[PDB]
Amino acid sequence: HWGYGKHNGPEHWHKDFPIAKGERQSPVDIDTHTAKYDPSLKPLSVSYDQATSLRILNNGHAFNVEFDDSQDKAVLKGGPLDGTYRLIQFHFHWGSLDGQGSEHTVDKKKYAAELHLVHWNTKYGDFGKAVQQPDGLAVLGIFLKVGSAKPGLQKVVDVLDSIKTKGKSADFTNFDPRGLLPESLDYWTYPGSLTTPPLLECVTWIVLKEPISVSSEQVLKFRKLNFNGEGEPEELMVDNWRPAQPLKNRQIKASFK
Numbered sequence: 080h081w082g083y084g085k086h087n088g089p090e091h092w093h094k095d096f097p098i099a100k101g102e103r104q105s106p107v108d109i110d111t112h113t114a115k116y117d118p119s120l121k122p123l124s125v126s127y128d129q130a131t132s133l134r135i136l137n138n139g140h141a142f143n144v145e146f147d148d149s150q151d152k153a154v155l156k157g158g159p160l161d162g163t164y165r166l167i168q169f170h171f172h173w174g175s176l177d178g179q180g181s182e183h184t185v186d187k188k189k190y191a192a193e194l195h196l197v198h199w200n201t202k203y204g205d206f207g208k209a210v211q212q213p214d215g216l217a218v219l220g221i222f223l224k225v226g227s228a229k230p231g232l233q234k235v236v237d238v239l240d241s242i243k244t245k246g247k248s249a250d251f252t253n254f255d256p257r258g259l260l261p262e263s264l265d266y267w268t269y270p271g272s273l274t275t276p277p278l279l280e281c282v283t284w285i286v287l288k289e290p291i292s293v294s295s296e297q298v299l300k301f302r303k304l305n306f307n308g309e310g311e312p313e314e315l316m317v318d319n320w321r322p323a324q325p326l327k328n329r330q331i332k333a334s335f336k
């Protein structure tokens with residue numbers, strides 16, 4: 080029954096998921112002055128040209144755009160990563176107001192939202208086995224700020240009316256996630272965790288420095304989704320973000336000088 084409310088939110092999660100107080104939890108604040116350029120990072124490769132989206136689902140916590148990950152169709156390689164990581168889904172976290180919503184922060188700045196493109200390490204065969212490994216997942220995180228509209232987001236925005244409540248899904252084929260990227264692939268990276276229960280410490284985080292701009296109308300439509308199921312009291316799906324967690328014994332590395 081975890082969620083984002085006062086009675087089931089991030090400050091309660093540790094009771095059922097004690098790893099919430101672990102040594103490599105996410106998100107974190109990215110102190111840009113302390114992060115260090117790492118010459119050992121290889122070029123990052125986002126290869127999404129053959130992506131096969133399938134479906135969009137309101138899971139009661141966010142909405143996921145799901146991909147066919149039965150072959151190496153959309154993959155992430157390079158950067159800090161060893162081997163090949165296959166795209167399985169993306170989703171967002173967002174706020175009730177434009178001044179909050181991101182999970183990672185940059186010098187304590189909160190963005191209006193944060194996109195997570197979730198990938199699993201193909202050496203482990205399936206996502207469920209990958210999440211049991213310290214290098215099982217790679218999540219590409221992209222900040223959203225409110226300004227001009229992001230054209231490649233509009234197809235997502237326009238289907239949300241059909242998945243308003245928890246458990247609803249809709250066909251979402253032929254969506255191109257390349258339309259959600261910014262121009263630059265400059266990034267910060269560090270070892271962390273899933274940001275929702277079960278909070279497993281299996282993620283290499285790659286957080287892009289350049290945000291994408293989305294319009295006020297686009298993010299307003301995110302905020303019309305519901306956490307609740309159909310026929311239940313309406314609880315707007317807003318503020319579905321975990322705050323920054325202690326950095327502990329970690330260093331954030333930058334891909335750029």
Ligand SMILES: CCCCc1ccc(S(N)(=O)=O)cc1
Pocket residue numbers: 195197210218272273274275276277
């Ligand atoms: C075991 C199922 C895990 C699903 C899940 C996938 C990704 C994230 S996030 N927000 O990108 O760290 C959270 C949860």
Ligand SMILES: [Zn+2]
Pocket residue numbers: 170171172195274
């Ligand atoms: Zn996420």
